[PDB]
Amino acid sequence: TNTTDNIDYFDISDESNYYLISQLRPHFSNIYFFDEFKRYASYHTEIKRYEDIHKTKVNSLLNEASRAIGICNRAKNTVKGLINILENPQKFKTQRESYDVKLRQYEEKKEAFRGCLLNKNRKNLDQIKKINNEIRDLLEKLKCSQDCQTNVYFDMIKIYLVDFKKMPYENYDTFIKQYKNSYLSGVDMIRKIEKQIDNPVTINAIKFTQKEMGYIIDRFEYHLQKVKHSIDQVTALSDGVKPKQVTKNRLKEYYFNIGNYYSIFKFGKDSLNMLNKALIHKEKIVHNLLGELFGHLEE
């Protein structure tokens, strides 16, 4: 475990904060909602035309959203290399630049890489807003007028709960706090030991690895609440009273929320799965150094 070899954990949100871009495919949670709406349209004959939208408008968007990330892939490799010299003290010695000047480039390169993923999909952002609005216009095709049946909407919730049951939320909840406790235990130790040791290169390499680790935990913690918000609300609707027939315009709002809430759960599960693997990996790096720190002070 010399250095980190995966940097798929970075993400960025727009200023309006409605859209979160992840490096993991589909890169957008709304595509998962679009994929999940296709399940809705299969049961209703009136929305059978939606398959053309999915075959063309949404499928091209996934390929187009993925391509915009590829332009940032080259800038990603530039940033990725900067971490390796910063995190490894023996590699940092060859560079022989100040720790702060090497840190300043990283911070500017961190936003620049963050900025590329955000800026390249800006034209794509208007598309996802255009697709789901088109689906709102398509939902006027249902042959109901204040008598829309809620069966299909409710048969999906009992199936979703089973899909909800597969993911173990409680194991993830234990993972973060214990790791975050070790994160705390590392940092508060460093603030008092930095005065004790005179060489900073080895402890600065940790201090960087710790600072980046703190960034990774927030992405895990943020997604966990949204997955927790997705399990709670969908489960609460199953607890709530179920009417067979609702308004046409209201059924549109019914369909959107479950797919909206479910898409975040699907999206969070992918990021949560990757984030812990990067979290335990950074924990593996912080510890191979801790052994290197103690041995040198002995002699």
Added chain:
Amino acid sequence: CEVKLVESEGGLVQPGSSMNLSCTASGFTFSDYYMAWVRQVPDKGLEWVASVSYDGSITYYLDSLKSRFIISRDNVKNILNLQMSSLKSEDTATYYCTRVTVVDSFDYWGQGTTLTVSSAKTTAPSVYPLAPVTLGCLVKGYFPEPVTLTWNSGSLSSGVHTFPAVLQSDLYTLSSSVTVTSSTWPSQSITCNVAHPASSTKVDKKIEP
């Protein structure tokens, strides 16, 4: 800036097909909206012709017209294309280029192109002045049918009564009348103006008492 749809002729064709139509879209993104065409007849617009998907892969044809019609769309040049084979006197039509929303409603319409399919020779109109205070003018035996009648080079728009054309046996026929005061008749006397755009014949013969 403005969404609009233009169309190609149109005009007289022979039964054996030989006719293609194109349509131009502007002011909006071609790829997001479907593209359909609609057929027109004197008593219409009941029948609707094909529509094409964004990619252009899947298209639906009228069961009656599936065998003799092919649709295509050019997303690159913003062109909507109709192909016809073995045209018939039922295929005689006006065609309006349309934008199709997701709800399958036609939100915008093109200017329209008029198609006629038969085996009638193009025939210039024989023009006859009519005297008796009503003044008339008779046009008989004129193919093709699209013709306008001008009165006084457009100097009198009051009292003019253009009547709908009537085809009898083989050829269209139409008459029109003008009503002017008797005291205005002597000072200024004027022809009925008949112009045949399809046979390109525009002749005029003054009214003779």
Added chain:
Amino acid sequence: VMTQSQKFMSTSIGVRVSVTCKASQNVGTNVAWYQQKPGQSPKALIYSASYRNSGVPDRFTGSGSGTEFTLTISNVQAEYFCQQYDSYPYPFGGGTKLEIKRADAAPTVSIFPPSSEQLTSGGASVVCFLNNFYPKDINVKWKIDGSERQNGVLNSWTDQDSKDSTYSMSSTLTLTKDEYERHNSYTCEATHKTSTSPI
């Protein structure tokens, strides 16, 4: 697959007017309404019965669900089409033309001898012109030499005049020169809401 329409309706400026469309197998909210000028392309103002596009004046409204639909408009300054876009084929109603009420009028009858160039051309056509007749209901009797003829007469009816709200009728009798010698005079007879006015 389902389609209906109704006969034309006659109203005057400016009152509220309904247009009746039904059809056979419930299409829900899936209906569309288009306005067609007498010589211009059709324009869509109403989709899904109750929703109107932009660029559509506020007076146009729509209502109805299921099988039956109606279109009401409060004010007025042609032909209107109701459509089902729900299932193939997507058919429009036959359409109802709109006319304007007015006071009744009598037809101005006029007779014309055949043109000098026509008798040279071996043909002879006499036309009778009945103009500004209101209402649209009218009849034309053709009598040659005082004897009625029911063959060889071709008539056409003008669309309702937008300016004066008066219909127009043209009746033409075409006939060879060898039969024009039967009479040297001619009359045109017209049934209408008045004592017969035959000239």
